[PDB]
Design a binder for this molecule. Structure first.
Ligand SMILES: [Zn+2]
Ligand SMILES: [Zn+2]
Lengths: 48, 114
């Protein structure tokens, strides 16, 4: 009861602003993905 | 190794022993046709059996639109650049992911493996 009636003051939500990252993070993620795909390609070449 | 057939009944020739001249004779069970063989080996069993598919690869696979193509591997015979390639594409091939190549130039059909 106490926490609910206090939460009536602070509030809570979830949204796109909470699910969106920053440009630097997007660059990091894309770099990591490209490196991983390149490494998989290298492994396939060595196997062939 | 192979199967050889009698010329009279056209049945399989089983090996029969000639206990007089110490020689091998192939004889059938339908008629009395005899023969002398050149293999001199009744039975052969290889358990490795790592057959190179270059005998079993058809040259007609070059017309497949779903196969990858490369131009960094020119054909040994006709020097054509483009050459289709694929894997073993067969079972009982252990796990070898070796590539196989077929030249895409018509009537060349060169099938090698670097
Ligand atoms: Zn016969
Ligand atoms: Zn060729």
């Amino acid at each position: 009861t106490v926490i609910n009636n206090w939460l009536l003051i602070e509030g809570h939500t979830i949204g796109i602003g909470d699910s969106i990252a920053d440009s630097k993070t997007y660059q990091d993620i894309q770099n990591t993905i490209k490196k991983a795909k390149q490494d998989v390609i290298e492994v396939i070449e060595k196997a062939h | 190794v192979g199967i050889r057939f009698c010329q009279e009944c056209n049945n399989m020739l089983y090996p029969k022993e000639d206990k007089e001249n110490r020689i091998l004779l192939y004889a059938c069970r339908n008629c009395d046709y005899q023969q002398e063989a050149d293999n001199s080996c009744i039975y052969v069993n290889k358990i490795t059996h790592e057959v190179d598919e270059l005998t079993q690869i058809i040259a007609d696979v070059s017309q497949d639109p779903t196969l990858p193509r490369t131009e960094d591997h020119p054909c040994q015979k006709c020097g054509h650049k483009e050459a289709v390639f694929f894997q073993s594409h067969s079972a009982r091939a252990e796990d070898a992911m070796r590539l196989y190549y077929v030249c895409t130039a018509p009537h060349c059909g060169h099938r090698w493996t670097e």
